[PDB]
């Protein structure tokens, strides 16, 4: 009979368990997978460890920065000054070669226009509903706003590619204010936000940081079998796995990805406001992909606008013997069959021309049954309902990026939610 069962060993569940353990409470962690990290994941590609889920971080993200400080992780610098070529692929398929300086000027000036109201709308962005106007703007799509700004062709296409990636969806579906909030969190500053999304990653890898947090937990651990049901009463909670084993505790922290709750039986059932959020709020259809090209392409970056499938194509490595390793982020995996190698290769040739594609490693996060969304992009009309999902239901408590006040599409939000849920249980037990 545990003080707390924590369901899920991604960043939010690990931080929750670390906080409760540090409070002297007894903790059981239950994880479906045989690994830590959740939607962060390190795998081998061509014998090199690569991040294939989330990994970009910045010190303007205070919760992940605090953990990096605690465990001694630094910021690894992406090779931006070394960038040789930048390309924009428009929605109609036309590709243009843009000097990086021009690309940065047009992109950042478009971003500033898109986010110009961030200080008005989000004076206290870690309390993002403080200005009630954001609840009424929730139903405006990112595309509705984008088209109101008088942007030029490159500004429009690059911003729409960015917003397609963040939404994991056509930009007609993304909540406009939910994205502007990230600008506000970055000190209402376009350079800081656009830096945050490209300049740094976790030195040593997200898996090592998860391991360090896990190693600080004094908890029992059960990996490899998913939770199938959760039942609570006035005196406790009982959690049943799909192999029919049963565990019991006074409280339960759920960190499941929002759409996965539909695969778990809750007794009593979750309230209507949570079931509505579970059905409608999330949508991100993302996947990640690494490709090996025989040719040495140098250090290139490509943005492709919707409905091109490869919204961002970054260069992980290049040299005259290796060729090139490309890191590709796909906002809408529905647009390409990632089991079809030659279809992947054809899209690489559309961008990079006369090249030979040798190997591909996709990770389809949307089709992963324990993820189902790549990151908690908020559908228009739903960003302002996130407290319906974050609030406790008696002995059940809820964490995960989607429940965060701040950086809700990020590792930082997952960590925030772990600190917060540890606080809620601290007081529930007082
Ligand atoms: C391709 C990609 C790019 C991204 N880029 C960035 C980025 O640059 N920077 C950034 O900060 N964030 C980024 N993100 C987002 C970030 O990775 C996630 O927001 C964050 O990792 C979510 O943490 P979490 O703890 O909320 O959820 P998760 O990590 O999903 O953890 C939930 C856990 O619950 C487990 N689980 C699911 N079902 C069950 C069940 N029935 N029983 C038991 N356990 C279960 C899952 O296995 C998982 O371990 C990216 C994500 C992806 C996929
Ligand atoms: Ca160079
Ligand atoms: Ca500003």
Question: In the chain, what are the domain boundaries?
Answer: 1-78+197-281+376-430, 79-196+282-375
Q: How far is the CA of 295 from the centre of ligand 1 (A)?
A: 34
Cα–Cα distances in Å, from 36 out to 118, 123, 386? Answer: 35, 36, 25
Give the C-alpha separation, 186 to 166, whole Å. 16
Residue pair 399/16 in contact (Cβ under 8 Å)? The answer is yes
Give the C-alpha separation, 214 to 222, whole Å. 13
Residue pair 83/301 in contact (Cβ under 8 Å)? The answer is yes
374 lines ligand 1 (CB under 6 A): yes
Q: How far is the CA of 167 from the centre of ligand 3 (A)?
A: 23
Q: Any binding-site annotation on 33?
A: yes
Half-sphere exposure in the Cβ direction for 101 (13 Å, CA): 0
Atom of ligand 1 nearest to the CA of 255: 32
Substitution site in 34, 40, 76, 221 for ligand 1 pocket (most atoms within 8 Å of beta carbon):
40
Task: Indicate which technique resolved this structure.
Answer: X-ray
Per-residue tokens: 141: 């799509």
400 lines ligand 1 (CB under 6 A): yes
Substitution site in 5, 7, 8, 364 for ligand 1 pocket (most atoms within 8 Å of beta carbon):
8
> Beta partners for 25?
none
Q: Residue 39 burial by CB count (10 A; 0-12/13-18/19+): exposed, middle or buried?
A: buried
> Beta partners for 430?
none
Q: Any binding-site annotation on 12?
A: yes
Residue 230 CB neighbour total at 10 angstroms: 22
Residue pair 183/112 in contact (Cβ under 8 Å)? The answer is no
> In sequence order, what are the residues at sequence separation of 6 or more whose Cβ sits closer than 8 angstroms to the Cβ of residue 244?
none
286 lines ligand 1 (CB under 6 A): yes
Q: Any binding-site annotation on 249?
A: no
Q: CA 417, 419, 422, 428 torsion: positive or negative?
A: negative
- The structural architecture, per CATH, of the domain 1-78+197-281+376-430 is 3-Layer(bba) Sandwich (3.50)
Substitution site in 12, 38, 403 for ligand 1 pocket (most atoms within 8 Å of beta carbon):
38
Q: Whose CA is nearest to atom 12 of ligand 1?
A: 410
Q: How far is the CA of 107 from the centre of ligand 2 (A)?
A: 21
Q: Whose CA is nearest to atom 21 of ligand 1?
A: 39
Q: Any binding-site annotation on 347?
A: no
Helix (H, G, I), strand (E, B) or coil at 104: helix
DSSP H or E stretch at residue 223: strand 219-223
Q: Whose CA is nearest to atom 48 of ligand 1?
A: 38
Give the C-alpha separation, 253 to 8, whole Å. 9
> What DSSP state is assigned to residue 137?
H
Q: How far is the CA of 171 from the centre of ligand 3 (A)?
A: 23
Q: How far is the CA of 347 from the centre of ligand 3 (A)?
A: 37
Q: Any binding-site annotation on 175?
A: no
Q: Residue 350 burial by CB count (10 A; 0-12/13-18/19+): exposed, middle or buried?
A: middle
Q: Any binding-site annotation on 55?
A: yes
Q: Whose CA is nearest to atom 13 of ligand 1?
A: 54
Q: Whose CA is nearest to atom 26 of ligand 1?
A: 400
DSSP H or E stretch at residue 372: none
For 306-370, where are the alpha helices, taking DSSP H only? Answer: 341-352
Residue pair 306/164 in contact (Cβ under 8 Å)? The answer is yes
326 lines ligand 1 (CB under 6 A): no
Residue pair 277/408 in contact (Cβ under 8 Å)? The answer is no
Give the C-alpha separation, 187 to 189, whole Å. 5
Strands in 237-311 per DSSP E: 237-241, 246-254, 265-267, 287-293, 300-304
């Amino acid at each position: 009979i545990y003080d707390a069962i924590v369901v899920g060993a991604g960043f939010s569940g690990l931080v929750a368990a670390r906080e409760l353990s540090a409070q002297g409470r007894s903790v059981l962690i239950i994880e479906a997978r045989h690994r830590l990290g959740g939607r962060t994941h390190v795998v081998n590609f061509l014998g090199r460890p690569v991040e294939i889920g989330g990994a970009g971080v910045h010190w303007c993200q205070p919760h992940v920065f605090a953990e990096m400080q605690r465990y001694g992780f630094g910021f690894k610098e992406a090779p931006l000054a070394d960038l040789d070529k930048a390309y924009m692929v428009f929605a109609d398929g036309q590709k243009i070669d843009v000097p990086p300086a021009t690309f940065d000027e047009e992109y950042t000036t478009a971003f500033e226009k898109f986010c110009s109201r961030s200080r008005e709308l989000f004076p206290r962005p870690y309390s993002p509903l403080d200005n009630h106007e954001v609840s009424n703007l929730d139903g405006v799509s990112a595309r509705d706003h984008l088209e109101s700004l008088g942007l030029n062709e490159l500004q429009l296409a690059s911003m729409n590619a960015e917003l397609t990636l963040y939404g994991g969806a056509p930009t007609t579906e993304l909540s406009y204010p939910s994205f502007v909030k990230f600008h506000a969190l970055a000190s209402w500053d376009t350079i800081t936000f656009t830096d945050s999304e490209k300049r740094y990653h976790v030195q040593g890898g997200t898996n090592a940081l998860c391991q360090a947090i896990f190693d600080d937990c004094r908890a029992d651990s059960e990996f490899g079998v998913p939770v199938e049901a959760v039942a609570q009463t006035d005196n406790g909670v009982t959690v049943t796995l799909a192999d029919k084993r049963v565990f019991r505790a006074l409280t339960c922290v759920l960190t499941l990805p929002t759409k996965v709750y539909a695969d778990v039986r809750f007794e009593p059932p979750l309230p209507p406001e949570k079931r509505a959020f579970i059905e409608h709020a999330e949508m991100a259809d993302g996947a990640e992909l690494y490709v090996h090209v025989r040719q040495n392409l140098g250090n290139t970056f490509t943005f492709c606008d919707d409905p091109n499938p490869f919204n961002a194509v970054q260069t992980y490595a290049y040299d005259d013997e290796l060729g090139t390793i490309l890191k590709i982020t796909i906002g809408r995996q529905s647009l390409i069959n990632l089991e079809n190698f030659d279809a992947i290769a054809a899209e690489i040739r559309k961008i990079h021309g006369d090249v030979e594609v040798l190997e591909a490693l996709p990770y389809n996060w949307a089709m992963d049954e324990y993820a189902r969304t790549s990151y908690p992009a908020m559908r228009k009309g739903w960003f302002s309902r996130y407290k319906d999902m974050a609030k406790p239901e008696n002995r059940l408590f809820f964490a995960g990026s989607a429940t965060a006040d701040g950086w809700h599409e990020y590792i930082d939000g997952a960590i925030e939610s772990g600190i917060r849920v540890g606080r809620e249980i601290r007081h529930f037990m007082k």
